[PDB]
C-alpha cells in the first residue's frame, strides 16, 4: 500500500557521524510511532505524543533527528551491520525499512 524509502546502503569513516533516515510515502496513514532497531537491539523510539526515547546503550553517542531519523555519533566498526526503521501506523499497521551500514 505504502512504501518506505531509506538512505540505502552506506559507508562512513571510523569516529565520524552518520544520519539514518526513512520516509513513509504513498499512504495517508497516521504514524503512531517509529522504532529504530538492530536485529536484537532497540536504539530509539520517536513517539508522536511522547517524543524521543533513546536506549541507554546508545544515549551518549546518538542524537535524535533530523525528523524521525537518527544520528549515529563516534562510529566504531562495531556499529557495522543492519539497521531497521519500523513505522507503527494507523490504520495500515507496520511498515519496515532496512538500512545497511559499513563503518
Amino acid at each position: 500500500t505504502g512504501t518506505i524509502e531509506t538512505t540505502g546502503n552506506i559507508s562512513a569513516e571510523k569516529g565520524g557521524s552518520i544520519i539514518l533516515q526513512c520516509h513513509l510515502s504513498s499512504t495517508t496513514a497516521q504514524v503512531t510511532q517509529v522504532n529504530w532497531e538492530q536485529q536484537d537491539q532497540l536504539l530509539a523510539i520517536c513517539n508522536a505524543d511522547l517524543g524521543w526515547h533513546i536506549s541507554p546503550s546508545f544515549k551518549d553517542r546518538v542524537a535524535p533527528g533530523p525528523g524521525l531519523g537518527l544520528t549515529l555519533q563516534s562510529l566504531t566498526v562495531n556499529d557495522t551491520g543492519e539497521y531497521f526503521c519500523i513505522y507503527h501506523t494507523y490504520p495500515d499497521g507496520t511498515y519496515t525499512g532496512r538500512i545497511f551500514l559499513e563503518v
Binding site: 497516521q30 503512531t32 511522547l50 507503527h88 499497521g93 507496520t94
Partner: protein, 115 residues
C-alpha cells in the same frame, strides 16, 4: 519487563468462531504506555486488525474480525482477537503486537489450526 502472554496454538472449528488470546502483562512497579494493537499474518507487514488509542479499531480482512477486549478511554492490555466463521484458508501463524513506549514492540506468534 512488559511481557505478552498467549498460547502458542489455538484450534478452531470450520465455520465456527474462535478467539486468539493475546495479553500484555505489565508489572505494577513498571511504567509504560501502549499506543496500539496490531495483528497480522506471520511474515506479512501491515495490519489485518489494528486498534489505536484514539482512533479505536479497524479491521481490514473483513467484518469477520473483532477486538473482544480493547476499548477507547481505557488502557490497552488485552489485544484478544475473535475470528468468525473460520476457513480452511484461515490456518496459519499470526502475530499479535503491542506498540509500547519506551519498551518498544512486544509481540508473539500464535498458530491458528482449522478443523
Amino acid at each position: 519487563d512488559v511481557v505478552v502472554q498467549a498460547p502458542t496454538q489455538v484450534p478452531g472449528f470450520l465455520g465456527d468462531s474462535v478467539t486468539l488470546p493475546c495479553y500484555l502483562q505489565v508489572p505494577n512497579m513498571e511504567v509504560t504506555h501502549v499506543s496500539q494493537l496490531t495483528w497480522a499474518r506471520h511474515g506479512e507487514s501491515g495490519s489485518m486488525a489494528v486498534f489505536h488509542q484514539t482512533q479505536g479499531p479497524s479491521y481490514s480482512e473483513s467484518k469477520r474480525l473483532e477486538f473482544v477486549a480493547a476499548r477507547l478511554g481505557a488502557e490497552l492490555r488485552n489485544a484478544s482477537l475473535r475470528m468468525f466463521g473460520l476457513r480452511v484458508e484461515d490456518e496459519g501463524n499470526y502475530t499479535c503486537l503491542f506498540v509500547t513506549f519506551p519498551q518498544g514492540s512486544r509481540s508473539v506468534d500464535i498458530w491458528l489450526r482449522v478443523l
